[PDB]
């Protein structure tokens, strides 16, 4: 399913069809993207369960070599990093950075804290490690100077913001899908009816609430105007 189908299901359940409606489809996109992460955490955080393939998305990143701090000699070895800021993954799925082929290569996505201290094991000196720095970029680290030649990776994970990771979606065979509404929403069908129910409950009450409608330099909500 696509963003369009979910959005218009929510709108039609709410009957927000007129262009002169207070709650636009943008409210629907916001609520859908947040309630998706809410439901996924509620279902896949208590105890470890199988996560379907629908909850995931693949972003494609372009890597650039950057200094550790600045251009000094003693400031440590350089890191690669994605050109643009990367979405934050949830901790419920199977995050994986792969070199444009999911079935090959070993690039390990680890925590920020762990990546401070990796590769000291002599047999793990050739493994590329990944983490999202507080800067918001995906930083790469390894002890094997060959890693700095890496130019492109794809990252598959259950990203915490469907909109961000869908905007960073990888080019399809036909070409890029410009409109977000024509892209595919990241959620299993078994979680779609609950998601629609939660969003529709969220906006049902506000839909029929009064407005401060008189232009009279006055607050008109206490009078239910």
């Amino acid at each position: 399913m696509t963003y369009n189908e979910l959005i218009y299901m929510v709108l039609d359940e709410l009957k927000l069809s007129s262009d002169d409606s207070y709650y636009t489809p943008d409210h629907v996109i916001f609520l859908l993207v947040k309630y998706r992460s809410f439901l996924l955490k509620q279902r896949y955080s208590d105890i470890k369960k199988q996560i379907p393939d629908s909850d995931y998305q693949s972003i494609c990143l372009d890597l650039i070599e950057v200094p550790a701090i600045s251009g000094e000699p003693c400031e440590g070895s350089s890191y690669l990093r994605s050109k643009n800021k990367v979405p934050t993954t949830m901790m419920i799925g199977n995050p994986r950075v792969y070199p444009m082929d999911f079935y090959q290569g070993e690039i390990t996505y680890i925590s920020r804290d762990r990546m401070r201290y990796v590769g000291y094991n002599k047999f793990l000196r050739n493994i590329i490690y990944c983490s999202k720095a507080p800067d918001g970029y995906l930083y790469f680290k390894s002890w094997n100077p060959q890693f700095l030649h890496l130019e492109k990776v794809s990252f598959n994970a259950i990203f915490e913001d469907a909109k961000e990771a869908s905007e960073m979606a990888c080019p399809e065979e036909n070409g890029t899908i410009c409109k977000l509404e024509d892209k595919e929403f990241p959620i299993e069908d078994a979680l779609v009816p609950p998601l629609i129910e939660l969003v529709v409950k969220e906006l049902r009450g506000p839909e029929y609430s009064p407005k401060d409608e008189d232009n009279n330099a006055k607050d008109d909500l206490p009078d239910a105007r």
């Binding site: 369009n4 189908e5 218009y8 299901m9 709108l11 039609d12 927000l16 069809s17 007129s18 262009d19 002169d20 409606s21 489809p25 509404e181």
Partner: protein, 226 residues
């Protein structure tokens, strides 16, 4: 009832040329009031606003048998070329010019992008202009292989917004009734553009209801200042 019977029964009901006070009308006023009663009655019946029936266009066999003789079906494949619409995939079709209300309305699609669903009979959904912007991208209420959006515009036109090409336009409407003219009118006079005698085309069942409504209209006409 025939025109002679309309006239005679109408005179009898008004007690024309009786000893008590009464009303005598010319055949032209009989035609005027009978036509007004006819159109008012059938509009009220279509809209369901008649208290005596309280029923809509095809909601019972009674109303079916009343307005069965006004429903006409129309086909057209000619598209008006030069017009301004609210969508690139918008085509315009002319209305038969005698329509009052469109009750059934259908479009046939001929597009190579429809696979083996060519000629799919698509329902024409009349949409308000508020809903149009948010219905263009609707995948459940917008244009599709099974949906066409129709908007009324000036010059008696129908803007059909469709995702696929529209070749034909099938429609069923309530038609203009032939007025009730009881006498060939002199030069200059006419009712609904008709000058000669013109018999009611509805069923004989509703002719008497038309008669009593015409009588009440005449009484109101002659007794609205007294």
């Amino acid at each position: 009832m025939t025109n002679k019977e309309f006239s005679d029964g109408f005179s009898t009901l008004l007690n024309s040329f009786g000893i008590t006070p009464n009303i005598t009308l010319d055949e032209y006023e009989k035609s005027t009031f009978l036509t007004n009663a006819q159109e008012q009655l059938i509009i009220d019946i279509y809209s369901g606003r008649n208290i005596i029936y309280g029923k809509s266009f095809e909601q019972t066999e009674e109303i079916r048998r009343y307005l069965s003789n006004l429903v006409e079906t129309y086909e057209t494949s000619t598209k008006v070329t030069g017009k301004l619409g609210l969508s690139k995939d918008s085509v315009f079709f002319e209305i038969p010019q005698d329509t009052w209300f469109i009750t059934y309305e259908v479009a046939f699609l001929k597009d190579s992008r429809l696979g083996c669903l060519d000629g799919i009979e698509a329902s024409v959904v009349p949409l308000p202009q508020d809903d149009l912007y948010r219905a263009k991208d609707n995948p459940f209420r917008g244009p599709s292989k099974d949906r066409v959006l129709r908007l009324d515009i000036k010059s008696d036109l129908a803007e059909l917004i469709s995702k696929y090409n529209v070749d034909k336009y099938l429609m069923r409407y309530i038609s203009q009734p032939t007025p009730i003219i009881l006498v060939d009118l002199p030069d200059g006079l006419s009712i609904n553009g008709v000058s000669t005698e013109s018999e009611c085309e509805l069923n004989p069942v509703v002719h008497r209801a038309i008669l009593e409504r015409a009588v009440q209209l005449a009484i109101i006409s002659k007794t609205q200042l007294t």
